[PDB]
């Protein structure tokens, strides 16, 4: 059946983001669309489920020279006393049937955590210890020793923006939307490209997807510079170099791992 066609129509306009990027892969005629998707009331309903007799009646009494309002009228319509008990037990039984479809841890080296991932004679201790011991026998020099006009002033100058220890542009905005669209464009297609890359997949069926994806990387990126060229040749300002890293670094991973494959063979 044409299940895919119906799904596309539902998402044709309901959600822009999903369809917006899918077309872009075909706007420039990059690759076939087959690989795109291949890789990636209540009251009447209750009576419909609850009472089998109504279900049978509805099929046999399907609207024919009648009205739904008239059908609604038919719903509500000592021996009579027993009917309520039988109906409720039957009704309760039907509802019930309706909802029933047929290690102590241990370690060898805990010191490693104490000196964790963060990376990096004897007489000197004695000599230093004694010298400091006799240092503070004179104390409370606060009057002048703590600060001086020259020393204090130098600190203020350093704290100024020009001074040391105090080091200290949204011009493009319309272009921002295109980059975000491009960013989603790269992310949407990189995801599939990186979907199988981390896993080695030593199998032809899984590896074939890698080759198709690996070749597809060039195809999607073949058209990328063309869009880049137009944007770049505007004011030569606010260069977009990050977007290149993902593609170039994707190439390097592709080329390196592809080269590694030959060595393994």
């Amino acid at each position: 059946a044409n299940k895919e066609l119906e799904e596309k129509n539902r998402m044709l306009q309901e959600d822009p983001v999903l369809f917006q990027l899918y077309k872009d892969l075909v706007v420039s005629q990059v690759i076939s669309a087959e690989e795109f998707w291949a890789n990636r009331s209540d009251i009447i309903e209750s009576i419909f489920r609850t009472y089998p007799a109504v279900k049978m009646k509805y099929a046999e009494n399907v609207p024919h020279n009648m009205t739904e309002k008239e059908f609604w009228t038919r719903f509500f319509q000592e021996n009579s006393n027993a009917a309520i008990i039988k109906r409720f037990n039957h009704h309760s039984a039907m509802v019930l049937a309706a909802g029933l479809r047929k290690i102590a841890l241990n370690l060898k080296k805990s010191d490693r955590y104490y000196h964790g991932p963060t990376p990096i004679t004897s007489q000197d201790i004695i000599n230093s210890f004694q010298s400091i011991r006799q240092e503070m026998e004179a104390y409370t020099p606060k009057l002048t020793q703590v600060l001086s006009s020259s020393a204090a002033s130098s600190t203020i100058t350093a704290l100024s923006p020009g001074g040391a220890l105090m080091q200290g542009q949204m011009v493009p905005n319309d272009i921002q939307s295109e980059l975000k669209h491009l960013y989603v464009a790269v992310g949407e297609l990189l995801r599939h490209f990186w979907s199988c890359f981390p896993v080695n997949t030593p199998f032809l069926e899984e590896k074939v997807v890698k080759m198709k994806s690996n070749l597809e990387r060039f195809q999607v990126t073949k058209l990328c510079p063309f869009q880049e060229k137009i944007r770049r040749q505007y004011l030569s300002t606010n260069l977009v170099s990050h977007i290149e890293e993902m593609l170039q670094t994707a190439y390097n991973k592709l080329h390196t791992w592809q080269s590694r494959r030959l060595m393994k063979k």
Binding site: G187, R191, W194, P198, E245, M246, T249
Partner: peptide
């Protein structure tokens, strides 16, 4: 691997 700018951590790689 992503080489993608992530504003804050820890976030699972949207790509990797």
């Amino acid at each position: 691997q992503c080489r993608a700018k992530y504003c804050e951590l820890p976030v699972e790689c949207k790509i990797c």
